[PDB]
Write an enzyme that holds these catalytic residues in place. Structure first.
Site, PDB file in Angstrom:
ATOM      1  N   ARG A 207       0.559   3.726   0.633  1.00 44.55           N
ATOM      2  CA  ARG A 207       1.041   3.594   2.005  1.00 44.55           C
ATOM      3  C   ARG A 207       2.547   3.399   1.983  1.00 44.55           C
ATOM      4  O   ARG A 207       3.124   3.102   0.933  1.00 44.55           O
ATOM      5  CB  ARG A 207       0.363   2.406   2.724  1.00 44.55           C
ATOM      6  CG  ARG A 207      -0.986   2.746   3.425  1.00 44.55           C
ATOM      7  CD  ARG A 207      -1.239   1.822   4.648  1.00 44.55           C
ATOM      8  NE  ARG A 207      -0.213   2.004   5.676  1.00 44.55           N
ATOM      9  CZ  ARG A 207       0.016   1.151   6.676  1.00 44.55           C
ATOM     10  NH1 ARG A 207      -0.720   0.052   6.795  1.00 44.55           N
ATOM     11  NH2 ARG A 207       0.983   1.393   7.553  1.00 44.55           N
ATOM     12  N   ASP A 232      -2.805  -4.206   3.865  1.00 37.20           N
ATOM     13  CA  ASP A 232      -1.526  -4.905   3.664  1.00 37.20           C
ATOM     14  C   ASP A 232      -1.759  -6.138   2.771  1.00 37.20           C
ATOM     15  O   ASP A 232      -2.890  -6.590   2.617  1.00 37.20           O
ATOM     16  CB  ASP A 232      -0.941  -5.409   4.996  1.00 37.20           C
ATOM     17  CG  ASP A 232      -0.601  -4.294   5.977  1.00 37.20           C
ATOM     18  OD1 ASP A 232      -0.389  -3.148   5.546  1.00 37.20           O
ATOM     19  OD2 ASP A 232      -0.535  -4.578   7.197  1.00 37.20           O
ATOM     20  N   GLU A 503      10.023  -2.550  13.126  1.00 33.22           N
ATOM     21  CA  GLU A 503      10.478  -1.678  12.048  1.00 33.22           C
ATOM     22  C   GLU A 503      11.550  -0.735  12.559  1.00 33.22           C
ATOM     23  O   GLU A 503      11.324   0.016  13.514  1.00 33.22           O
ATOM     24  CB  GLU A 503       9.283  -0.928  11.465  1.00 33.22           C
ATOM     25  CG  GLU A 503       8.316  -1.871  10.737  1.00 33.22           C
ATOM     26  CD  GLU A 503       6.893  -1.351  10.692  1.00 33.22           C
ATOM     27  OE1 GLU A 503       6.124  -1.757   9.781  1.00 33.22           O
ATOM     28  OE2 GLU A 503       6.537  -0.539  11.575  1.00 33.22           O
ATOM     29  N   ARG A 519      10.494   0.300  16.370  1.00 32.98           N
ATOM     30  CA  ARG A 519       9.160   0.089  16.929  1.00 32.98           C
ATOM     31  C   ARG A 519       9.145  -1.150  17.818  1.00 32.98           C
ATOM     32  O   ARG A 519       9.763  -2.159  17.493  1.00 32.98           O
ATOM     33  CB  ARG A 519       8.169  -0.067  15.767  1.00 32.98           C
ATOM     34  CG  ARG A 519       6.761  -0.489  16.121  1.00 32.98           C
ATOM     35  CD  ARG A 519       5.982  -0.684  14.819  1.00 32.98           C
ATOM     36  NE  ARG A 519       4.690  -1.330  15.029  1.00 32.98           N
ATOM     37  CZ  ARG A 519       3.840  -1.626  14.051  1.00 32.98           C
ATOM     38  NH1 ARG A 519       4.148  -1.335  12.792  1.00 32.98           N
ATOM     39  NH2 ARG A 519       2.684  -2.216  14.337  1.00 32.98           N
ATOM     40  N   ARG A 581      -2.623   6.347  16.030  1.00 37.46           N
ATOM     41  CA  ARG A 581      -1.562   6.869  15.174  1.00 37.46           C
ATOM     42  C   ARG A 581      -1.898   8.311  14.828  1.00 37.46           C
ATOM     43  O   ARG A 581      -2.526   8.602  13.797  1.00 37.46           O
ATOM     44  CB  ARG A 581      -1.380   5.997  13.930  1.00 37.46           C
ATOM     45  CG  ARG A 581      -0.882   4.579  14.292  1.00 37.46           C
ATOM     46  CD  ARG A 581      -0.555   3.745  13.059  1.00 37.46           C
ATOM     47  NE  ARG A 581       0.272   2.587  13.396  1.00 37.46           N
ATOM     48  CZ  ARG A 581       0.461   1.545  12.593  1.00 37.46           C
ATOM     49  NH1 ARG A 581      -0.132   1.511  11.413  1.00 37.46           N
ATOM     50  NH2 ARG A 581       1.238   0.535  12.977  1.00 37.46           N
ATOM     51  N   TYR A 615       2.930   6.038   9.347  1.00 37.26           N
ATOM     52  CA  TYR A 615       4.276   5.823   8.803  1.00 37.26           C
ATOM     53  C   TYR A 615       4.800   7.099   8.149  1.00 37.26           C
ATOM     54  O   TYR A 615       4.028   7.902   7.620  1.00 37.26           O
ATOM     55  CB  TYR A 615       4.304   4.685   7.785  1.00 37.26           C
ATOM     56  CG  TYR A 615       4.206   3.282   8.364  1.00 37.26           C
ATOM     57  CD1 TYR A 615       3.342   2.985   9.416  1.00 37.26           C
ATOM     58  CD2 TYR A 615       4.955   2.247   7.824  1.00 37.26           C
ATOM     59  CE1 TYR A 615       3.245   1.695   9.920  1.00 37.26           C
ATOM     60  CE2 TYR A 615       4.862   0.953   8.315  1.00 37.26           C
ATOM     61  CZ  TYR A 615       4.001   0.684   9.359  1.00 37.26           C
ATOM     62  OH  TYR A 615       3.906  -0.604   9.840  1.00 37.26           O
TER      63      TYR A 615
END
Length: 658
Positions: A207, A232, A503, A519, A581, A615
């Site tokens: 990621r 994460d 971000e 963001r 997303r 991302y």
């Protein structure tokens, strides 16, 4: 071997094609392979590409299907009511729709292996699922099969799951072809892989991509090599890098830029079921969210990332403690020794461990690599490995000794359980990396580290200034260095969103003028501007014409070197969707020289609006093409966790976008 059936040029226009007479009597034995080259750039919500069914009244649940969803999910059903079997195997985000506006030929390989009792699916050279069952169901052993169908499943004489698309080629074999044989099947992929399962990182997941074009012509990429699924931190994650010396055509085997050894690097197929998918490696230290810049003066490449002590991530990091003690102007890393309930130690000059209670140095020192020595001798700890052999996640010692690191669970001296930022440098453009160094705290003793904005740092073109964006509650915190990364200072810029994952990525519009895109929590990408090389920042404005979700997604941005329509241009990469997303776009903005406003004039669709895009990293390649490395899935969705080989790289030309 040779196919038992082969056909092609099938147009699926919401009307099935019957291939019963061609195929059914050719099926024999318990193992089969289907190879299908197909396009679907306007799929229905749920559609069957291939079907074998009992079409008779009373047997509507006796069928085999290969199906896809308009989310890009691919799957199979294998069902026999008399046998009491109803298998459904699938993986989200397995397909391409369009590339450069043209329908992509997907190469699907489905292997039904009776010997190993396993169903395996590949798309575009990537294994997307491998499922072993106790009671195997050969696809042609379904009771009363009498139809073979393209573009639907015939149930009780009617067309169900009608498809829109085309099958350019389809072959079937009465054999389960080997993984080796699968690899020889020709592909028509619109993308490349830089990092991938089974490479030198031994991570099964990736990621948080970055890209940066170096002055030599080399293009460098960093990424989270994520071991414990796509979660994460807390987890096990290392930062890995790879570079290309041929404008992105080929990439080097990855190496690590930042790595911990407290847990083994294991390639694990993380569980995706609803009971176990939230299993998370809980005792490992990790790195997360990397960012890269090149310093023209020193020639050094600089990479920062967040650092997490064992068991720590954004959600449980101590927000009220930097992990450093301020003693007369300087900051010293605090340590807690086993047995103590408080942090009585600091790491002073020369790595000497100092007792704050007695103000005496101890016999311990912390080295280069944040490892603990006692009287100059290296201490070790036993490494952990993880497994699901018992039906749940187990983390257990594996017999191997590794250097004792202050970020480790088993260490005699431990850092404050909070988040830090570290930096490493390379003097050979990514062929090797120095041991990382922690950055100092910027927001005082009683504040956790800021969070690095993944992607690129900014090297100002007409000075030696380097800037890395970071965020925290209520502000962007810009980290500024004018001495090749040796020392940093902060520049805080208030934002009107409380606890946003803000971000942020920057472009230099012209000399000394920086625009930062970031963001937010509002569904719109924000921006702010500095006209003094990052010293001070404007209030926040919003970009109209792009939609994000309420939670938002990281955005990447570059200043293009060539004029477009006679104007300076900025290119933005982001999902454009209110529903998840997905719907990735590159958006070309033309700069108005009179007020530095930007006309967002061209929107290029990376793939279908319904296909995943999270991302992303963009860079201008030395040949003025654009390289994009991106998460081709919804990395927020709790239905699309733990997918392999979804961070993908594409090459685009400016004319493709406009």
């Amino acid at each position: 071997i040779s196919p038992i059936f082969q056909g092609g040029s099938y147009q699926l226009n919401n009307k099935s094609i019957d291939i019963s007479s061609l195929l059914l009597d050719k099926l024999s034995g318990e193992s089969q392979t289907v190879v299908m080259k197909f396009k679907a750039d306007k799929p229905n919500s749920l559609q069957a590409l291939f079907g074998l069914s009992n079409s008779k009244a009373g047997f509507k649940n006796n069928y085999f299907s290969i199906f896809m969803r308009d989310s890009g999910e691919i799957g199979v059903e294998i069902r026999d009511a008399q046998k009491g079997i109803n298998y459904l195997f699938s993986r989200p985000a397995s397909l391409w729709g369009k590339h450069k506006g043209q329908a992509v030929e997907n190469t699907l390989v489905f292997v039904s292996d009776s010997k190993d009792k396993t169903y395996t699916m590949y798309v575009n050279g990537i294994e997307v699922f491998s499922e072993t069952v106790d009671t195997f169901l050969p696809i042609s052993n379904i009771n009363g099969i009498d139809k073979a169908t393209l573009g639907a499943v015939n149930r009780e004489g009617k067309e169900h799951y009608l498809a829109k698309g085309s099958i350019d080629e389809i072959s079937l074999f009465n054999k389960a072809i080997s993984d080796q044989e699968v690899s020889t099947i020709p592909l028509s992929n619109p993308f490349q892989l830089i990092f991938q399962s089974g490479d030198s990182t031994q991570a099964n997941y990736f990621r948080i991509p970055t890209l940066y074009t170096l002055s030599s012509g080399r293009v460098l990429s960093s990424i989270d090599a994520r071991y414990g699924g796509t979660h994460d931190s807390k987890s096990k994650i290392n930062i890995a890098t790879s570079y290309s010396d041929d404008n992105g055509k080929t990439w080097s085997e990855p190496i690590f830029a930042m790595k911990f050894n407290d847990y083994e690097e294991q390639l694990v197929y993380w569980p995706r079921d609803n009971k176990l998918k939230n299993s998370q490696i809980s005792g490992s230290a990790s790195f997360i969210d990397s960012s890269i810049v090149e310093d023209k003066k020193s020639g050094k490449t600089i990479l920062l990332a967040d650092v997490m002590p064992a068991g720590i991530g954004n959600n449980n990091a101590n927000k009220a403690d930097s992990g450093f003690k301020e003693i007369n102007g300087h900051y010293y890393l605090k340590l807690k020794k086993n047995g103590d309930n408080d942090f009585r130690y600091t790491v002073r000059e020369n790595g000497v461990v100092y007792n704050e209670t007695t103000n005496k140095p101890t016999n311990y020192t912390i080295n280069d690599k944040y490892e603990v020595l006692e009287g100059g001798k290296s201490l070790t700890v036993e490494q952990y490995s993880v497994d699901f052999d018992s039906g749940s996640l187990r983390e257990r010692h594996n017999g191997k000794q590794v250097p004792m690191n202050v970020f480790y669970k088993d260490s005699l001296f431990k850092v404050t359980p909070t988040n830090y930022i570290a930096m490493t440098t390379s003097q050979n453009r990514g062929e090797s990396w120095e041991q990382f160094k922690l950055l100092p705290p910027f927001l005082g003793e009683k504040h956790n580290g800021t969070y690095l904005c993944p992607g690129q740092g900014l090297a100002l073109k007409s000075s030696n200034r380097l800037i890395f964006a970071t965020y925290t509650s209520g502000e962007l915190t810009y980290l500024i260095s004018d001495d090749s990364g040796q020392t940093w200072k902060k520049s805080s810029a208030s934002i009107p969103f409380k606890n946003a994952t803000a971000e942020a990525q920057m472009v230099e519009l012209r000399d000394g003028v920086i625009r930062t895109f970031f963001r937010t929590t509002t569904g719109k990408i924000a921006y702010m501007t500095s006209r003094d090389s990052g010293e001070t920042w404007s209030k926040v404005s919003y970009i109209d014409g792009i939609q994000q979700t309420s939670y938002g997604t990281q955005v990447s941005a570059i200043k293009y070197s060539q004029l477009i329509d006679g104007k300076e241009a900025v290119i933005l990469s982001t999902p454009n969707s209110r529903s998840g997303r997905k719907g990735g776009q590159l958006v070309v903005g033309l700069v108005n020289k009179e007020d530095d406003s930007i006309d967002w004039k061209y929107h290029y669709g990376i793939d279908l609006p319904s296909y995943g895009y999270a991302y992303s990293a963009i860079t201008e390649l030395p040949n003025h093409h654009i390289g994009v490395l991106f998460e081709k899935y919804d990395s927020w969705s709790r239905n699309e966790l733990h997918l392999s080989n979804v961070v993908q790289y594409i090459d685009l030309e400016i004319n493709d976008l406009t």
